[PDB]
Amino acid sequence: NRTRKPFEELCTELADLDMPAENIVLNRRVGQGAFGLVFGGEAKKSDLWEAVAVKVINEKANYEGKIDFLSEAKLMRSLNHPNVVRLIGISLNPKASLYLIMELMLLGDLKTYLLSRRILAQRSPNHEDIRPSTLTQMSMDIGQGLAYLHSKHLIHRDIACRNCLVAADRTVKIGDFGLTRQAALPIRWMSPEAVQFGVFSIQSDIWSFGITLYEIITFGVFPYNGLGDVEVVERVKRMEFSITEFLPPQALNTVVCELINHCCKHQWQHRPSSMNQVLEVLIAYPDCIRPFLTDDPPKP
Numbered sequence: 001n002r003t004r005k006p007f008e009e010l011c012t013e014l015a016d017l018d019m020p021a022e023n024i025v026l027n028r029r030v031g032q033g034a035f036g037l038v039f040g041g042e043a044k045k046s047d048l049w050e051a052v053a054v055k056v057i058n059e060k061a062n063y064e065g066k067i068d069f070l071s072e073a074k075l076m077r078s079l080n081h082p083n084v085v086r087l088i089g090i091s092l093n094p095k096a097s098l099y100l101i102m103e104l105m106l107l108g109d110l111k112t113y114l115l116s117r118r119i120l121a122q123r124s125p126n127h128e129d130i131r132p133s134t135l136t137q138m139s140m141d142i143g144q145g146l147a148y149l150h151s152k153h154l155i156h157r158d159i160a161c162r163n164c165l166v167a168a169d170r171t172v173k174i175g176d177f178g179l180t181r182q183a184a185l186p187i188r189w190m191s192p193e194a195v196q197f198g199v200f201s202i203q204s205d206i207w208s209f210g211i212t213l214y215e216i217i218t219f220g221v222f223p224y225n226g227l228g229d230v231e232v233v234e235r236v237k238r239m240e241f242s243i244t245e246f247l248p249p250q251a252l253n254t255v256v257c258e259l260i261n262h263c264c265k266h267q268w269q270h271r272p273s274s275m276n277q278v279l280e281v282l283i284a285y286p287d288c289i290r291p292f293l294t295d296d297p298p299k300p
């Protein structure tokens, strides 16, 4: 064998993180993740219990899949930040599958969050969940969490409202690192220098961050809604219609419209050199993130 040894040498380094299956119990079906279902329950860190969600993949798939499964956890262990989801352990060979244990975010992801609290914005626009005081702090938490990733020479390459989870504290954190690589497909969240060229940088992550901001101020619309995935690879290269054109007419004079337009510029020499240029903006204008909606909900 030549691919069945990679698994058993990898778990040697991740051996201090193994937990017996008698310390993990499954209660809920939290959601349908990318590769398998995620379950919700409680895990005991040999001392006390904590509410936890688990990513699970059965032991029937190829070893090629199990290596990527454990590589997500190995990368996740190198992180510690109040705006990044932190794992607490793994579990090797429990009965039918392999377990990935990561803390529970009570209020789910951000896209389903906004999609469910849409009419609440049209009827109660000053609510503790969805007011510019909270939306700006949320986008700010995502920003400094991505700045923490970039600080330690990491590129996420997949910034969207699907990979940002919110907890009962209503603080948001970075969620999915399935596509995260080292420092030097979601095409709608990718700058053109990363689409036709396959090169990723901090500026490509800033492009996806600006797309996330458009996704937030619209409460979850599908970027470039109405254009197929084949029409967008040709339209974004020749600088026609930045994402700002897809906004309601209530924008195009605001501070958030310009911001996502500077974060999403074809000339990456004009894009911010670091996430801290964007973060320092979110302090001079603390009510920039506003809900800009229509009377017709978005159609996925």
Ligand SMILES: Nc1ncnc2c1ncn2[C@@H]1O[C@H](COP(=O)(O)OP(=O)(O)O)[C@@H](O)[C@H]1O
Binding pocket: 030, 031, 032, 033, 034, 035, 038, 053, 102, 103, 104, 105, 106, 108, 109, 162, 163, 165, 175, 176, 177
């Ligand atoms: N720790 C968690 N807390 C709450 N929900 C989660 C958690 N982990 C995963 N999920 C749910 O499972 C899916 C995320 O799994 P993943 O494969 O990481 O997909 P994504 O690309 O959305 O991050 C989402 O639907 C999300 O709502």
